Amino acid sequence: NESISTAVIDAINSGATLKDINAIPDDMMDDIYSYAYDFYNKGRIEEAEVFFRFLCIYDFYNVDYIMGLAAIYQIKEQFQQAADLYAVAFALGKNDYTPVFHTGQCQLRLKAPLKAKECFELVIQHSNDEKLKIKAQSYLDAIQ
Amino acid sequence: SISTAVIDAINSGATLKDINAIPDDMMDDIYSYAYDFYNKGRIEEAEVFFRFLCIYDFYNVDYIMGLAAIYQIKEQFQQAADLYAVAFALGKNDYTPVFHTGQCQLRLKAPLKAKECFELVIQHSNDEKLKIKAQSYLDAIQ
Amino acid sequence: SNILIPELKAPKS
Amino acid sequence: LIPELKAPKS
Secondary structure (H helix, E strand, O other), X not given: OHHHHHHHHHHHOOOOXXXXXXXXXXXXXXXXXXHHHHHHHOOOHHHHHHHHHHHHHHOOOOHHHHHHHHHHHHHOOOHHHHHHHHHHHHHHOOOOOHHHHHHHHHHHHOOOHHHHHHHHHHHHHHOXXXXXXXXXXXXXXXXX | OOOOOHHHHHHHOOOHHHHOOOOHHHHHHHHHHHHHHHHOOOHHHHHHHHHHXXXXXXXXXXXXXXXXXXXXXXXXXXXXXXXXXXXXXXXXXXXXXXXXHHHHHHHOOOHHHHHHHHHHHHHHOOOHHHHHXXXXXXXXXX | OOXXXXXXXXXXX | XXXXXXXOOO
């Protein structure tokens, strides 16, 4: 079985295309991230939306960027777009069940309680986040 | 890249999907995302998904095909051809990966290997529409 | 309908 | 209601 496994991995582990950030050094990204964050927590959503989009354009693979932009679309009730990014964060970010919990929130709002139900159940089987599991059973219970 | 719980999946023989108890219905939904984004030309997202799916299940021919199609579209012809070689070993009688390998070989400046791919298609495929293009490329290669 | 765009298996319908 | 972002500082 082993050389199929590694042939696959070898091909992906060279298909790593760019890291996106066009030699515009790291801790600079951080500062932009920090205002996006400060704009967001402050409720200046239009600015926070520009900053996160700008960061996601620069580095599509950073889960925090994707999660910030997804959170904005969520707050804006652009729920399909939020859920689309949360699926991306999930596929990038692989451990955390947060984007799956937030997708349940989105699917609820997209009139698909069935999908929503599956999300919160997944969080319940796989999360080890106590708080998140509570929230997730709460939603689950509420839509029975 | 980062997470080499991929090295454990390898020697032990399992897939990361199994190792992490990911539901089939979940994998299928990530697949549908990967498929839709791809058909929609949203190639950066589709690549994120197909990459995830290939990492979580290196034995899924459909995942391997998706990622190799993405690399073909992005002109990463060497990576596409390496994945098609794997997809062919897995599906081991679908000639679509062999055809698309012929297309990659042509772009890699290897018209002779491209020709033998296309010949292999004509010699063994039962797919008519695939043979038709294989035979066109073979005629065009002189 | 382009030959340079592979056509992927449709998700299980 | 409002999702909770990871706090800055790398």
